[PDB]
Amino acid sequence: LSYRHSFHAGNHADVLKHTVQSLIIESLKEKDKPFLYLDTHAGAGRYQLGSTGKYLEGIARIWQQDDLPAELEAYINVVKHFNRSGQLRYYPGSPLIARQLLREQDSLQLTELHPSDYPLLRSEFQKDSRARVEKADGFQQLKAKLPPVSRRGLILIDPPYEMKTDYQAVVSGIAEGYKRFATGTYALWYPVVLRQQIKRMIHDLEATGIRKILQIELAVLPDSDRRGMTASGMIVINPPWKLEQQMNNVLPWLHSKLVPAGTGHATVSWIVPE
Ligand SMILES: Nc1ncnc2c1ncn2[C@@H]1O[C@H](CNCC[C@H](N)C(=O)O)[C@@H](O)[C@H]1O
């Protein structure tokens, strides 16, 4: 099988989501008791870069910096593992960040619905039995797979929002999971195409009544109409205690490296305090 390409792989949004994902993982790993990594929309696994691409404006701009903040080391070491030649050939998606950062006793439950990617994802874990890869509706897995036998977990919800109903399924998906496993860490990625649909989403999430909801947004441009995705963010329910401080240490740096021309913003606030 051939690795999927993706013109947008490793852009600013991946750098943010994968930074945060890796920080949550390293943080859950402080205790030597297994945990579960559930990836509702897992993608293909990795992405062949080039033949160009938005990685030149994103991961390429941080991975070899001499002042790389220590809070990005875990993440950047996984990019490097997949790029031994020292140039950027492949970018690891969420499942391979997990595959590489998780220990032998940990588990991964990964769902990818699209027929193009799903075969590649499955081949990524052909000989990794800590993983279960299935072609299924990711939101459905929040009903079924929780709680995990381990009673510890990071749940990553990273939908493409190519259907506006995604703004719905994420809030009710998280409500379904939270009901069954109220102490897990849920990390929801979101693109800011039209800010309004993000404000609706955040409110429903607030309607849920769930507590301790952190917000981390990195915008490259201002809120714009018909200029595509201007920003992206991670919404973390039950963030590990020092995630907010790590993101305040590292996010200005991220923003100055990814957005050298000074547009946008980079903020770390609480959607629901606890
Ligand atoms: N309902 C869905 N269930 C599972 N997968 C879905 C669903 N809707 C879209 N998808 C796929 O999951 C991917 C969404 N991007 C996820 C990126 C991945 N988490 C990563 O970090 O690289 C795409 O490949 C979608 O085709």
Residue numbers in the entry: 2 to 52, 58 to 280
Quote the study that presented this structure, word for word.
We previously designed adenosine-SAM bisubstrate analogues that contain the SAM cofactor with the S-atom replaced by a N-atom directly linked to an adenosine at the point of nucleophilic attack to mimic the substrate/cofactor bound state.
We first investigated whether CA could be accommodated in the RlmJ active site similarly to the SAM cofactor. CA and SAH exhibit the same conformations and positioning of both the methionine chain and the adenosine moiety in the active site of RlmJ. The adenine ring is moreover sandwiched between H42 and L119. This structure therefore validates the use of this SAM analogue for the design of RNA–SAM conjugates presented in this paper. Interestingly, H9 swaps conformation from solvent exposed in the RlmJ/CA structure, to buried in the RlmJ/GA* structure, from where it can π-stack with Asub.
